[PDB]
Amino acid sequence: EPFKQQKVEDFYDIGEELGSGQFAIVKKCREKSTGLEYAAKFIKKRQSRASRRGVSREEIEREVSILRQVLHHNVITLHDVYENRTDVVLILELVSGGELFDFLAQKESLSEEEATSFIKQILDGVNYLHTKKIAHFDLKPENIMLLDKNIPIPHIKLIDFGLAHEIEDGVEFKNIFGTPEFVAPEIVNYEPLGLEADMWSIGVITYILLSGASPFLGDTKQETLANITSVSYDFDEEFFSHTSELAKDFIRKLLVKETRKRLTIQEALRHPWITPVDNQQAMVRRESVVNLENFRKQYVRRR
């Protein structure tokens, strides 16, 4: 339905900053009428076409269209949409538990069983999207949030659908976007895009989650892109000495250039590392640990 033309401030209390993109600013908010808390995403609108600042009507309407479709316990929910002269404001589910990687860095120990549990949460959210032919296109640790960091096993919420796109039958979608470190070769090569790009990103997130190291990240953006296109990564024993074989197989099957060869979200969920076939493989996963020393070190370096 239409965006609300009323003043956001007239119906919402505005609190602290939660974050921002280049073209958006997210703030904690409360609906005066209900007393309920949400997050208000203020997206700056473009003036005409050649504007350096602002997001286009098409891109704003796409994000809204996608968010209005999604109702899943591992995905952020949309509440309301407002529009003024400068901004289109998205009223979203309040997510305030911080980044998953922040929480993990806090743990005294982490087993691969625990790790897979969090990974499955992401996989469950992505599956829901992919079933609806929706690609997220921006899967990275920043966009992997939690509701509450104070329950034993926190619940993951996938956020920021600014780059999300509905995959159409027989329509070629080609674009260059996202954070270099996490993008699939087809993005870099300006080649047809689909749901496969998300699966590559999951492989990168898993890699970092288990090691602290990033598979393709170089000294510069130039190096990073060269590594991605040539698929040049390793399981160095400095970072992967504790890692199980199935964990490496899971990643190895996700970091594949050929899109048709890469695991689908369904194939990823069935994979023995996520889903043990017998008690043996379940116990191997249970006893395998993540070196949080390396994970923590590298995460603080991201701060």
Curated annotation (Swiss-Prot):
> What is stated about the way this protein's activity is regulated?
Activated by Ca(2+)/calmodulin.
Q: Which GO terms describe its molecular function?
A: ATP binding; calmodulin binding; identical protein binding; protein serine kinase activity; protein serine/threonine kinase activity
rRNA processing in keyword set: no
Q: Which residues carry this modification: Phosphoserine?
A: 288
Q: Which top EC class is given?
A: transferase
* One GO BP: apoptotic process
Kindly identify the residues recorded as the active site: 138 (proton acceptor)
**Keywords, ordered alphabetically:** Apoptosis, ATP-binding, Calmodulin-binding, Cytoplasm, Cytoplasmic vesicle, Kinase, Nucleotide-binding, Phosphoprotein, Serine/threonine-protein kinase, Transferase
Name the residues that span the membrane. none
Catalytic reaction(s) noted: L-seryl-[protein] + ATP = O-phospho-L-seryl-[protein] + ADP + H(+); L-threonyl-[protein] + ATP = O-phospho-L-threonyl-[protein] + ADP + H(+)
Outline the inducing conditions: Up-regulated during granulocytic maturation.
Q: Which residues bind ATP?
A: 18-26, 41
Tissues where the protein occurs:
Expressed in neutrophils and eosinophils. Isoform 2 is expressed in embryonic stem cells (at protein level). Isoform 1 is ubiquitously expressed in all tissue types examined with high levels in heart, lung and skeletal muscle.
Region annotated Autoinhibitory domain sits at: 281-290
The UniProt entry lists the main location of this chain as cytoplasm
Question: EC?
Answer: 2.7.11.1
Which cofactors go with this protein?
Answer: Mg(2+)
Does Nucleotide-binding show up as a keyword for this record?
Answer: yes
**Domain annotation Protein kinase: ranges:** 12-274
> Where is it found, in Gene Ontology cellular component terms?
autophagosome lumen; cytoplasm; cytoplasmic vesicle; Golgi apparatus; intracellular membrane-bounded organelle; nucleus
Comment field on protein domains: The autoinhibitory domain sterically blocks the substrate peptide-binding site by making both hydrophobic and electrostatic contacts with the kinase core.
Family per record: Belongs to the protein kinase superfamily. CAMK Ser/Thr protein kinase family. DAP kinase subfamily.
Tell me the subunit arrangement. Homodimer in its autoinhibited state. Active as monomer. Isoform 2 but not isoform 1 can interact with ATF4.
- Please explain the role this protein plays, according to its UniProt record: Calcium/calmodulin-dependent serine/threonine kinase involved in multiple cellular signaling pathways that trigger cell survival, apoptosis, and autophagy. Regulates both type I apoptotic and type II autophagic cell death signals, depending on the cellular setting. The former is caspase-dependent, while the latter is caspase-independent and is characterized by the accumulation of autophagic vesicles. Acts as a mediator of anoikis and a suppressor of beta-catenin-dependent anchorage-independent growth of malignant epithelial cells. May play a role in granulocytic maturation. Isoform 2 is not regulated by calmodulin. It can phosphorylate MYL9. It can induce membrane blebbing and autophagic cell death.
Please report the name of this protein according to its UniProt entry.
Answer: Death-associated protein kinase 2
Species name? Homo sapiens
Question: Quick one: which gene encodes this?
Answer: DAPK2
Q: Which residues of the full protein are shown?
A: 12 to 314 of 370
